[PDB]
Amino acid sequence: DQAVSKQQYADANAAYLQSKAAVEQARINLRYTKVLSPISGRIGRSAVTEGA
Amino acid sequence: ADGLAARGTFTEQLQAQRDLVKASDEYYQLADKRYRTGVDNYLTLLDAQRSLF
């Protein structure tokens, strides 16, 4: 409807993608918890235990 | 005598108001340039048309 500008939509879309990138940072930083296996194979000892 | 006074100084009012209309017209032209470029929204162009009218 051109009730807003193109610039005050462009910076809002930029802030949308920046906040999406910050949520992606938080999601990978939560995926770093519950540590996933890097490669498939045979596992050794649990050198750390529960609570340590 | 009052009509001679009006003919003596209404030119220096009509030229001033015509310069005001020309200045507001080129103000609206610059606001339309800002709008068609995309910097300001349509409501500021409507404010420019309000002032020009």
Q: What angle do CA A11, A8, A18 make, to 5 degrees?
A: 20
| Resolution to 1 decimal place, in Å | 3.8
Q: Cα–Cα distances in Å, from B30 out to A33, A41, B27, B45, B48?
A: 56, 69, 5, 10, 9
Strands (E), B1-53: none
The experimental technique used to determine this model is: cryo-EM
Query: Diameter of chain B by CA atoms?
Result: 55
Q: Cα–Cα distances in Å, from A8 out to A23, A33, B5, B24, B40?
A: 23, 38, 54, 26, 9
CA-based nearest distance A22→chain B, Å:
28
How distant is the alpha carbon of residue B7 from its chain centre? 24
Q: Which of B40, B44, B45, B47 to mutate to test the interface with A (most CBs of A within 10 A)?
A: B40
The whole-angstrom separation of Cα A46 and Cα B4 is 110
Test A5 with B41 for CB contact under 8 angstroms. Answer: yes
Which of these, B47, B27, B30, B49, lies nearest to B39 by C-alpha position? B30
Answer yes or no: are the C-beta atoms of B33 and B45 closer than 8 Å.
Answer: no
Q: Cα–Cα distances in Å, from A36 out to A26, A29, A44, B30?
A: 16, 12, 15, 60
Residue found by looking up tokens 């006074």 in the block: B5
